[PDB]
């Protein structure tokens, strides 16, 4: 959940917005060996329900998340139920698990290419166009994370945009992302310089990958 | 429907068959203005009911079909109810109005493209790819006619096959067609050729789309 202030400028402006749980267990092996232990139930509950509280008002907030990366747990299921309950005016997306979970009402892949399969085991990314027509599937399709900016990159953004225009449930995606996170560091002159991973003595590290 | 002898062939040698009826109003304007006329009702039926009386215990024929290029009239919807009812072992199809009507069980259009698409009035030929993630369809999509195999031809044959083989509710379909409808005329010298439209004094004709 972002700074209060946030979701009152997105109203005023005009922005539709994903409001989302602050849980993430990436690091986990396997990823979702917490949120399918019962034990860290509590724990997710009051990230998931003190969002829903705080934000309900806001028109700009259209769809609520469930969190990102953390595989699919049964706390998951229990979790958007909840949400499914109290707040029937918005719809429930979550990534983990593949994507396709009974935990989102919209397919929401991240990185799935457009005419291309990446058969992955277990959580397979298809090419979005297939997606859409797997036997007994009829959900919308709108990537979560897609064409990721780092340094000289998005090509092929393109080819996202004429199947966007051309599937009317291809509903599009958030670009992966707006803002570098680099640091600011001085020389010997009080010059500025643009910092990443390992430039405070910081490891293990992941260098550039921040930005 | 075909020689009898077909059949028996077809279940020994093993092949799949779509029977279908000998109902073709291609000629009328609109092209559905007898088959929605219900005093063409009892002409229509009897070609339907009686090849289903005849063929019905063959094992090659696994998909009955009404007939071809009549556009879409409450008389297939009768016809088409009437087979549902008297022989549930088989799905039914029908291209016409559409080809994807009330009227059929299966998406069997008419030379629809792989990536294309072909927004005609009320009777487009979506790209077979984008046909079946259409808002609420659920159907496999096997083509009744496609690859027109007229002269020197076949190109882009291979993009189907590659579809096919991505995406599971494409299926697959029928060429257009097996055998060149030329004709034996014979020259002063007594030598054959073949002949095609016209070549009887036949007119009007359409010439060499025959072959
Ligand atoms: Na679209
Ligand atoms: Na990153
Ligand atoms: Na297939
Ligand atoms: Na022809």
Redesign the pocket.
Do not use: A, N, S
């Given at each position: 959940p972002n700074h209060p202030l946030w979701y009152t400028l997105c109203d005023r402006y005009g922005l539709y917005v994903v409001d989302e749980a602050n849980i993430e267990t990436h690091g986990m092996v396997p990823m979702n060996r917490l949120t399918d232990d019962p034990r860290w139930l509590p724990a997710m509950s009051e990230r998931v329900t003190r969002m829903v509280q705080r934000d309900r008002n806001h028109p700009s907030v259209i769809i609520w998340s469930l969190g990102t990366e953390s595989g699919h747990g049964a706390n998951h299921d229990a979790l958007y139920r909840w949400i499914k309950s109290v707040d029937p005016s918005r719809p429930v997306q979550y990534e983990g698990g593949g994507a396709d979970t009974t935990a989102t009402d919209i397919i929401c892949p991240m990185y799935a290419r457009v005419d291309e399969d990446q058969p992955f085991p277990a959580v397979p990314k298809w090419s979005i166009k297939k997606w859409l027509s797997l036997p007994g599937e009829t959900r919308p399709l709108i990537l979560c994370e897609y064409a990721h900016a780092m340094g000289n990159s998005l090509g092929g953004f393109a080819k996202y945009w004429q199947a966007?225009?051309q599937?009317?449930?291809?509903?599009?995606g958030f670009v992966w992302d707006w803002v570098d996170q680099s640091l600011i560091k001085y020389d010997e002159n009080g010059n500025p310089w643009s910092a990443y991973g390992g430039d405070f003595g910081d490891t293990p590290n992941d260098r550039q990958f921040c930005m």
């Open positions: 966007f225009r599937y009317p449930r291809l509903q599009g």
